[PDB]
Amino acid sequence: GMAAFSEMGVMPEIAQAVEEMDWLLPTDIQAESIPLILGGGDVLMAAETGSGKTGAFSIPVIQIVYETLKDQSGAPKALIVEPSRELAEQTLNNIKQFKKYIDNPKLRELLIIGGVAARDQLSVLENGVDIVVGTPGRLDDLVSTGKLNLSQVRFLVLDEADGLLSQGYSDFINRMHNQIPQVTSDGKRLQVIVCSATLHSFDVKKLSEKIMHFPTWVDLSVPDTVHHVVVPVNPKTDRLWERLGKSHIRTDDVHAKDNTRPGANSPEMWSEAIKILKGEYAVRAIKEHKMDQAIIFCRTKIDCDNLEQYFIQQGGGPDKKGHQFSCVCLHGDRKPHERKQNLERFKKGDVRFLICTDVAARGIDIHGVPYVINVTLPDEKQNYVHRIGRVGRAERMGLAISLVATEKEKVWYHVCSSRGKGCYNTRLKEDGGCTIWYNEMQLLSEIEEHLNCTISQV
Ligand SMILES: Nc1ncnc2c1ncn2[C@@H]1O[C@H](COP(=O)(O)OP(=O)(O)O)[C@@H](O)[C@H]1O
Ligand SMILES: [Mg+2]
Numbered sequence: 001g002m003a004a005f006s007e008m009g010v011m012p013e014i015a016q017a018v019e020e021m022d023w024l025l026p027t028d029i030q031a032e033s034i035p036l037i038l039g040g041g042d043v044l045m046a047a048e049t050g051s052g053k054t055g056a057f058s059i060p061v062i063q064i065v066y067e068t069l070k071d072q073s074g075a076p077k078a079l080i081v082e083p084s085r086e087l088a089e090q091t092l093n094n095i096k097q098f099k100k101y102i103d104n105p106k107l108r109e110l111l112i113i114g115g116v117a118a119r120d121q122l123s124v125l126e127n128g129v130d131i132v133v134g135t136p137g138r139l140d141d142l143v144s145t146g147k148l149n150l151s152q153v154r155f156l157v158l159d160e161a162d163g164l165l166s167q168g169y170s171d172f173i174n175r176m177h178n179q180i181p182q183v184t185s186d187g188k189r190l191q192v193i194v195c196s197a198t199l200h201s202f203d204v205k206k207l208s209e210k211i212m213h214f215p216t217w218v219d220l221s222v223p224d225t226v227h228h229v230v231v232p233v234n235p236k237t238d239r240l241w242e243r244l245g246k247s248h249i250r251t252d253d254v255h256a257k258d259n260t261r262p263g264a265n266s267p268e269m270w271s272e273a274i275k276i277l278k279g280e281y282a283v284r285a286i287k288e289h290k291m292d293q294a295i296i297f298c299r300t301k302i303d304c305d306n307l308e309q310y311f312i313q314q315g316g317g318p319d320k321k322g323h324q325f326s327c328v329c330l331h332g333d334r335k336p337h338e339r340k341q342n343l344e345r346f347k348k349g350d351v352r353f354l355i356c357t358d359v360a361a362r363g364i365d366i367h368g369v370p371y372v373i374n375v376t377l378p379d380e381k382q383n384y385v386h387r388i389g390r391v392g393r394a395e396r397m398g399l400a401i402s403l404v405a406t407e408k409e410k411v412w413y414h415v416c417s418s419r420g421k422g423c424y425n426t427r428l429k430e431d432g433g434c435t436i437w438y439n440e441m442q443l444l445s446e447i448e449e450h451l452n453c454t455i456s457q458v
């Protein structure tokens, strides 16, 4: 009953009104969202229609508008944008009801829609209004004629933001945010709410980036404090690898006995081209982003070792404290004491990069890193999340970069008793060997399928 909203820090007089409209318990989205919204932080709610988003903000807006009048006009304190006459009215009928048992003082609400005379709406405006619900058109109309004051708005809400963007109102939203001051007279910071029926939507992500301040995402996972992007590594459309000869990364020598010279026109050639390009692409990314810090995930112990040596060739290594390509490695063939020291040197900010394998990273605990680079994608799709999980403090968006080949790459598996040490059997697992044909595009597809979405490409 009304207990279920009171518990979350809702004013009892509001909670009572909510029980009386047959909202007896909160939706999962309301259960999570309201505490956050009362907390004053910016909140992006992403969940299907009918999950209770609109209600999640209808309830606590009244509280927040009330606690700002109790502390201090005629300028509205909260503006809610809806893409519908329909949705504006239901959203207004909610605010009407939940404000029922609030006196000392009462709260003045106003609809703002096409059809109803401005003279009705402007009588209401000149007088004293606290809470505005309306549609982009008249809201744009009535603000850009000097009618509707937004100076003291501390609670902005873009409901059905997906629809609002696809209805072409991005320009509007961005104007409204520029106009509303970022700090209130109270000294407090503008609270922005974004509701979406769609998740993973790029347009809503770009909107969260542009008009929200370190928002909390809410869904009924990808820690969306995280940008992540695929750089395809296509040795057919990038022919850089032909024009180096032997000024490149030391590859894994799976193709030592193979002809990988141009003209070979074999899968073995395209595979060695990839192994060469991943080198160049790793260096370029680090240069372009000017990365202060990153974790770098290689598939194997010697993949790590070979990248450390190439980083050395770039003025870096474990002996160049602070340099752009300063780094340490963390894997099996590293004595366990060297690991502990290598790891503290990374936490100290001695070296910029921590090069490690999935298996070594089980051992590590570390988060809040601004960059991860996946040189190669993980065998198990589950590990993409674990890997990406290590980027992005709440006060700094991280970035995962994944270098994904567009052809199959022959790599080492190793079935031999030696567990790698001294084996060079280039033949396939199938034919008694310690190599397989990796298919990184397929892994990506299984990964994108697991996250039930699409990852941006560059
Ligand atoms: N706690 C609740 N208990 C019962 N019904 C609720 C509750 N919250 C919302 N509803 C109702 O469920 C429907 C969906 O609510 P709404 O907030 O509009 O969802 P959304 O904005 O996610 O589409 C509405 O008819 C609303 O009145
Ligand atoms: Mg709604």
Ligand SMILES: [Zn+2]
Pocket (backbone or CB within 6 Å): 413, 414, 415, 416, 420, 423, 424, 425, 433, 434
């Ligand atoms: Zn082997």
